């Protein structure tokens, strides 16, 4: 694995021990060979579980998720996928790692795709080695891979709305269920229905994941209602998965706006990771996977791959060269390498709109490429009437930084800034000049 110009896909089945058994063996070998190594965790939750699996090995935890005192001698760094891509984009020296390990390397967030593109390009150049750890590499067609114990797979109608009858199997269960929903708002409705039926429910999404995930350990629960974020190495002591088999697809229309299309079918990889939450205990056969639709390759034309190209166009590689997407996922976008390359000041703006602005990549790019500076929020108000953002069926309103009440009507409409109450709250604070 560890020889330069090698990229290895460690594709053992979910629960095969890639993170807790294989990764420490790789890390020990890497330290023996004096390879400057980076380990990329998808989430802070996985970063913390990695510290336990790697404990005693000299690893620098580049995350506040781990409360350790680093010796200063470590040649192995551990950080989140997003932190890697963030540091590449910022005016900060990222070491030229000899070995690049990405855990949960199926993660389809733009920063994860960009990180794979950067790493795979360095390997192709002959500069580095890489290991991508995932049961479900890009283009996998197998939604039902092997497991530690037999799974009961059942195709069944799964509710996506509150229900009164017809789904007794949902509530008759006496164990613990992880339920994959296509959105936060959809999970809110299902969670309310279960809570009304006397169930204890925890809800997980990207913005709440670290905090809320700890509830799965610290309190008794009957259901976890989760978006696709729990595909990224989230482990539950569960005996059933209910999978809508649906997700939202961000789609750029006419190069002009982003909509959240669907819900529509998940990929085979997503379905295999959702299922893969259970069947993990070789002493507990007959965990259940109930699935409510088929799979499709909904990553094709999905905005995250175009957003990854905007990130990679703005990362220095060598002179004017630009990193390519990782070959197996490179056809998922119709993009021209370099088309999103920004001049110095516009690039800095782009980075800050993502890092401090917390705006989606596509929206950050529209603003920066228009020659708008980070603190200039006029664009949040001067869009067409059809870009009016609604709050409970009325136009959303903010007080501008000037103290004027205005309708939120962004010049560029990206549905992710108002996908749920928390998103819209964050975007209101942005339009108001509060960050
Ligand atoms: N525990 C430490 S001293 N970690 C660390 C070391 C070097 C860079 C970043 C780091 O993360 C931090 F900033 F959260 F501490």
Swiss-Prot record:
<comment type="subunit">
    <text>Forms a heterodimer with NS2B. Interacts with NS4B. Interacts with unphosphorylated RNA-directed RNA polymerase NS5; this interaction stimulates RNA-directed RNA polymerase NS5 guanylyltransferase activity. Interacts with non-structural protein 2A. Interacts with host SHFL; this interaction promotes NS3 degradation via a lysosome-dependent pathway. Interacts with host CEP63; this interaction disorganizes the centrosome and inhibits host innate immune response.</text>
</comment>
<comment type="function">
    <text>Displays three enzymatic activities: serine protease, NTPase and RNA helicase. NS3 serine protease, in association with NS2B, performs its autocleavage and cleaves the polyprotein at dibasic sites in the cytoplasm: C-prM, NS2A-NS2B, NS2B-NS3, NS3-NS4A, NS4A-2K and NS4B-NS5. NS3 RNA helicase binds RNA and unwinds dsRNA in the 3' to 5' direction. Leads to translation arrest when expressed ex vivo. Disrupts host centrosome organization in a CEP63-dependent manner to degrade host TBK1 and inhibits innate immune response. Inhibits the integrated stress response (ISR) in the infected cell.</text>
</comment>
<feature type="binding site">
    <location>
        <begin position="12"/>
        <end position="19"/>
    </location>
    <ligand>
        <name>ATP</name>
    </ligand>
</feature>
<feature type="domain" description="Helicase C-terminal">
    <location>
        <begin position="150"/>
        <end position="329"/>
    </location>
</feature>
<feature type="domain" description="Helicase ATP-binding">
    <location>
        <begin position="1"/>
        <end position="155"/>
    </location>
</feature>
<feature type="modified residue" description="N6-acetyllysine; by host">
    <location>
        <position position="207"/>
    </location>
</feature>
<feature type="region of interest" description="Important for RNA-binding">
    <location>
        <begin position="3"/>
        <end position="6"/>
    </location>
</feature>
<feature type="short sequence motif" description="DEAH box">
    <location>
        <begin position="103"/>
        <end position="106"/>
    </location>
</feature>
<feature type="site" description="Involved in NS3 ATPase and RTPase activities">
    <location>
        <position position="277"/>
    </location>
</feature>
<feature type="topological domain" description="Lumenal">
    <location>
        <begin position="1"/>
        <end position="435"/>
    </location>
</feature>
<protein>
    <recommendedName>
        <fullName>Serine protease NS3</fullName>
    </recommendedName>
</protein>
<feature type="site" description="Involved in NS3 ATPase and RTPase activities">
    <location>
        <position position="274"/>
    </location>
</feature>
């Amino acid at each position: 694995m560890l020889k330069k110009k090698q990229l290895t896909v460690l594709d053992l089945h979910p629960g095969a021990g890639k993170t807790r058994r294989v990764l420490p063996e790789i890390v020990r070998e890497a330290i023996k060979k004096r390879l400057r190594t980076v380990i990329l965790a998808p989430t802070r939750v996985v970063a913390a579980e990695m510290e336990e699996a790697l404990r005693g090995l000299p690893v620098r935890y580049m995350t506040t998720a781990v409360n350790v005192t680093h010796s200063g001698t470590e040649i192995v760094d551990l950080m989140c996928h997003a932190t890697f891509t963030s540091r590449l984009l910022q005016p900060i020296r990222v070491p030229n790692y000899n070995l690049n390990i990405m855990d949960e390397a199926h993660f389809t967030d733009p920063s994860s795709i960009a990180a794979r593109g950067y790493i795979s390009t360095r390997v192709e150049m002959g500069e580095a080695a890489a290991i991508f750890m995932t049961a479900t590499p890009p283009g996998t067609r197998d939604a039902f891979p092997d497991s530690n114990s037999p799974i009961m797979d059942t195709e069944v109608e799964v509710p996506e709305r509150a229900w009164s009858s017809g789904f007794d199997w949902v509530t008759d269960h006496s164990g613990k269920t992880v339920w994959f929903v296509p959105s936060v708002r959809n999970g809110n409705e299902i969670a309310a229905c279960l809570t009304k039926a006397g169930k204890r429910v925890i809800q997980l999404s990207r913005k709440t994941f670290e905090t809320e995930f700890q509830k799965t350990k610290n309190q008794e629960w009957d259901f976890v209602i989760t978006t696709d974020i729990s595909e990224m190495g989230a482990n539950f002591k569960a005996d059933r998965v209910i999978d809508s088999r649906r997700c939202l697809k961000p789609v750029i229309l006419d190069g002009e706006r982003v909509i959240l299309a669907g819900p529509m079918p998940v990929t085979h990889a997503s379905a295999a990771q959702r299922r893969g939450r259970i069947g993990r205990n070789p002493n507990k056969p007959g965990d259940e996977y109930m699935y409510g639709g088929g799979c499709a390759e909904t990553d094709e034309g999905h905005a995250h791959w175009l957003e990854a190209r905007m990130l990679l166009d703005n990362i220095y590689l060598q002179d004017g060269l630009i990193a390519s997407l990782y070959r197996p996922e490179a056809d998922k976008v119709a993009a021209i390498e370099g088309e999103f390359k920004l001049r110095t000041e516009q690039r800095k703006t782009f980075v800050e709109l993502m890092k401090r602005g917390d705006l989606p990549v596509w929206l950050a790019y529209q603003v920066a490429s228009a020659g708008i500076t980070y603190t200039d929020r006029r664009w949040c108000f001067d869009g067409t009437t059809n870009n009016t953002i609604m709050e409970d069926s009325v136009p959303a309103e903010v007080w501008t930084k000037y103290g004027e009440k205005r309708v939120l009507k962004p010049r560029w409409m990206d549905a992710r800034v108002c996908s749920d109450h928390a998103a819209l709250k964050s975007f209101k604070e942005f339009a108001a000049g509060k960050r």
